[PDB]
Amino acid sequence: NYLMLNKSLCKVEGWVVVAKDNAIRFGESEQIIVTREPYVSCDPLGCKMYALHQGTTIRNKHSNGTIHDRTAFRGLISTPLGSPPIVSNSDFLCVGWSSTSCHDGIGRMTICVQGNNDNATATVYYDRRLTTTIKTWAGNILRTQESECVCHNGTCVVIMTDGSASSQAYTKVLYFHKGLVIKEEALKGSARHIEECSCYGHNSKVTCVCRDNWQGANRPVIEIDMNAMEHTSQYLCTGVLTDTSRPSDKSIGDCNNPITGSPGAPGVKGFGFLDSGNTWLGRTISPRSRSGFEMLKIPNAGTDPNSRITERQEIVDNNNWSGYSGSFIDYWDESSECYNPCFYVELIRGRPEEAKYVWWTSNSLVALCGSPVPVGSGSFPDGAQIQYFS
Amino acid sequence: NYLMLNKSLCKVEGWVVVAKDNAIRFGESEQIIVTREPYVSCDPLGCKMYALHQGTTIRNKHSNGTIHDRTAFRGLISTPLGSPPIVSNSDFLCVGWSSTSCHDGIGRMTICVQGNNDNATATVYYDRRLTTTIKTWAGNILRTQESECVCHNGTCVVIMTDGSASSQAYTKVLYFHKGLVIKEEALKGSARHIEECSCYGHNSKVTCVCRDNWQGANRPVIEIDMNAMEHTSQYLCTGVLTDTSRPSDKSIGDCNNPITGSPGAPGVKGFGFLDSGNTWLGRTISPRSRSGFEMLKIPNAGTDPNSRITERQEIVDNNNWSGYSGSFIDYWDESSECYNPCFYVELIRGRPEEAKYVWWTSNSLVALCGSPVPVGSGSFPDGAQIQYFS
């Protein structure tokens, strides 16, 4: 029962919300675990939310200082999709401050990167048993996707990066079988820098839309052949820029070089589904800040430098905070002939953006799946009144 | 193992309480989720309470404002029947502000209606996977039963309404198979307006007792043939009025036209079991307010304009608040030769009725099943001391 990527993406005309944990709202009183860098991953038995906890809850004095990204008190938890995370409903999967996870159809592989910045090590699990470790190869924050990896025929592909965040680093494409590395490739192609890939599978291939944190306001793309276990990379061709921060959209994009001009923040994790006319990219509404979120239908964004937005759907309005976003698919819906594209938006509350109200930072989550038919509208922000926490 | 509606209703002489969550009482200190519009639905593995949460608990500053019916922070939860809802024991099923759910004997279908009032969309799930979406067709609050739907031979029937609440609207009878629409019927019959149907199955048919929110203090009834997948509608014939608000009972009712005179509130969700002499209707004791609850045995209420109350059983006394009520049956009790009629009463505490004490509104729940033999008596109100919350 190894998953075989034998389906194409469903056509998508709009997006509906399938889950929203309202974690910060509940967290005003209930013991909600402080998290960030969340994602969603499915398997034959259902779907779960994944997130890096901070070893504390929100209404807890230890929530002070949770703006920090790497501590010894972080780890990966999974909780039932739609539920906010508390101790009672959360599985503590591994220890670390960077992660990915995916199910090959038989067992789940999970990865936590832990340790000091200059001497970190990835811990790899298969079926909840430690199977391998991978030491840092560049000596500067070994790190991975912060969203689910993708499997085919027993092999799961994972993108990892080690080295400087602001200049040339060392990215590797890793192929796993039962939590053991069976092949590695140093990054190839024209992508200058790779961070936090959001991946999805389709017809024996995996496509990753990533984050250039060095030079690019256009997102790098990695293309993987899962039968040959080979990859290449480039940038999205469209002049419509989907990283944050970003300059204004160009009439003509660049398939092979990063587009510079990024006023402030070097990047944010994002995603995209590349399928000719059925192509959709996500992006924060603000080109400066992690606020708002919109889905853009941009036909041939992955092949056409002159491609343009043809449809748009607001998910979170610009008066509300967003954050990371990534792709996921239920690959085990045997009742559908295609893979329905889904995604999540991390809704970051607290610091740095709300530093005058609270001393913590944490997120809630909203998850969306595609519809082949025109749907309605609505905005789905975090929903908490931050002043309640002050 | 598709459910076949091959049984008649059990004879009922009285009602006993099978579950009572005492949610508001517990909610004085424990983290009870704020809910409204609850119901009960069973399947081969047991029965669960369903309810629309408000994305907060009661002892939480976000409980302020929960009188509101439609927000982006609402969704459907199921919790074990008899237990009050907390995060730890609640399944967050979908996002939205109107719902129904039912099990066909193999998989459960659930529906959440979400989005803005003028552009809402129903999200339909089967076995917890998103299967279809249904966009608003009238552009005014697409909405459904707020109690369980009913299945037969793999097909589940759902009543939905879109349009004005106070005048003519557009009601459709929807037939689902594995969460896919296989047939739709625009409302037929003499029912002028349809809201919040409470349905039950019997001998390959489904009977729905609904809420006219436009003109009628007498409840509309929908009759469905589940083999032919056709319906018609009318009103209850009895002059005994079971909506709220309502004028006094008439000596002669009207099978085909609504009975007007409703002093205040246009309606409340209610239910009834129509079975000749074995006919029972529920109603609030007050004809003005959602307070008290009584079961009335009214022989041939569905066929006889001159039908009268012959027996009565107080469930909640008139000094205590009630609310919505609806039907449910355990269709998988293979040890009984008949379907035993059951129902729930929503026990609404807080606003608007207790606005001087608290800023929230939420409910607890009591559930009753029939007995073929004379039973005892007792009143089962919410039980909380509202001033404890002030």
Next chain:
Amino acid sequence: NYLMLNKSLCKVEGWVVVAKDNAIRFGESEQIIVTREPYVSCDPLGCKMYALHQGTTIRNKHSNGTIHDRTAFRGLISTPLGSPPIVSNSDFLCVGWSSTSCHDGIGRMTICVQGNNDNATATVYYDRRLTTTIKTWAGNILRTQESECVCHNGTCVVIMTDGSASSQAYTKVLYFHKGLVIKEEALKGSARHIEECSCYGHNSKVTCVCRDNWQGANRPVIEIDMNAMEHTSQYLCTGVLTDTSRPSDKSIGDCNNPITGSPGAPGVKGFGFLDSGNTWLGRTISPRSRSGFEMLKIPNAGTDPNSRITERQEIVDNNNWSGYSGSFIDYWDESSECYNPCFYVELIRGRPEEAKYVWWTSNSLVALCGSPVPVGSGSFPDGAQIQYFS
């Protein structure tokens, strides 16, 4: 896989603690459910604690007034044995203020008595489905064991009582199959009054040690043949008195008449294991108050008027509160050739006895099983500091 009572009691030389929930201690801060009248019942999959909740937790303003025995906000919960009861780990089984439960080897039967004092009704469940109801027959607090019933060859025997607590009442011995009454017997024998029987099975028979609340400080005994479904009753023969309150022990007891002289309280639920020389009775250390608890080995207590205490084991010292006590056995330990006698002690804290400290009453629990070999010693009281709650 119906349970067959085909084993004799194990020999018992001493008692060891197998579970202690420390519910009141935990309840100083955690949301522990207010309970009383607890017991323990096993089945093929494990053992659980059962108790009548009060529809509130201890650190909750609704805990005020929980000295009351019968409200509409009570019900039966089961929780894993050894754990204190909270919402997250508790199964809410039925609604009512008196109960019993037992597993026949295939399904569990449970009973809750609910309603007003003058018009109460027992709700009977089998495999969590409502199967029958039993209306009051005497019109004064229909009531049952408050500990587990016992099954043999698909038939479960239950002792119930209806009528005056202080004079002649109407006790019936009920035989159930799959939650349906298949035989009833009005009380027979010389037992004058029967309350709260503690029963256990052995070699196709069930023995119940009960509570005379009218005249007797000696405990009535009911003897049942489970194949013939017939019973008789008498009193324990020993002059050692095991009810509370009680006068001093007599040198000669009375097998057929109650022994009077009870200074204050008319009775307390208790238990005993009758097995010739292997005979053990439990009793509060105080003959006036529900404080302390001791196990007494009294050879032939059930047949010999001159029988005497030969061994003693303190379970709870006299400086600590006890309460109800009852029997249970793991009838599904296929690895043992005999049935090992077990029991529980209800450890009542709060009112009336601690009325100057707190406004509530609730219990914790300690459970003991026998050992055929001499064991050690230790006292196992509730353990809470009541002043912490003031």
Next chain:
Amino acid sequence: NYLMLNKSLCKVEGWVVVAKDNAIRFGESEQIIVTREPYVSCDPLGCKMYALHQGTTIRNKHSNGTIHDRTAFRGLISTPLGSPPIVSNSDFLCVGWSSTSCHDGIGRMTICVQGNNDNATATVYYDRRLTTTIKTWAGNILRTQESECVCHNGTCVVIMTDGSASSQAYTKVLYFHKGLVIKEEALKGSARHIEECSCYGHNSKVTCVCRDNWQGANRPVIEIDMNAMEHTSQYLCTGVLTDTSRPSDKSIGDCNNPITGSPGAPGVKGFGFLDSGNTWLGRTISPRSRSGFEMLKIPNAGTDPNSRITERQEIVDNNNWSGYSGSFIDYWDESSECYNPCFYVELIRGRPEEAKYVWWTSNSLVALCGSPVPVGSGSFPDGAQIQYFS
């Protein structure tokens, strides 16, 4: 499916963290159970943390006085590995103040020692059913490992001790089958005193590294043949001392006699893996206090008096508290050809060491597994700010 110890230890070059419950941090607000003497034990279905609870949570007035080691309110809980212990996720296994537990591949055996110091009794369970009891044989605190026992071919070996803590006591090696004692051996060999053995299995043998609390700063070792069910004992040969407190390391150790000079505390539970060149011992960084923790690779520490540290890995820095430590292995990882050595460190917060801040004592936990390949670095202390609790 009885476990057969048919594998050797994996080679270990370094250690990675597989779990960290952050219990004290969470316990600032969430209802974390007060514990001490924790360990980890696995079985075919996963791994769980085990610990002796104190019958209270941290933010509970009953946490005052939890420095005490033996009360009637202690017991064993198991919780999912990686999670901090709360009531909702914890299994209350038995009552007592000393314990061990292990799975034979078919059922789990667990042991709790309970009762008064001069008359204690071990309660033995198999598959959660009480199977045997073992009365004290020396009359002074009957006690056992405080970490998992080890099974082979249906037989599980347990080390127990009864008598004086500061002079000659009576240690027995117990062999269990399905929770029944099938063989016992009085301690043999040159080990003068035995406390709190940390055991692991390999090639039909079990090796225990223990605690001499009488004379030795070098740790006693017990060697068991699981087929013959015979043992012997000695000391570690290395002059590198791994108990606490301890004098400085000697150039030459003693395989057969304890090394004295211990300035203060008579001992702490510790562990070691003895495998020639692949030999690793754990130890607190401080030779006086339970602070810090390091793993030392000491080739032939078990056979060579002149053996020396060749590699070192800091787990918890010396500015942070540690405590007990013990071994565990996942014996059911059929995908690995060897048994991977794992261990846990008890991270004790509160009294006596932090008596000026808080009135309680409790621990959090960190668990490590070996890697055959060089790994990174990082310190994993408890992480709580003790002043938050004051």
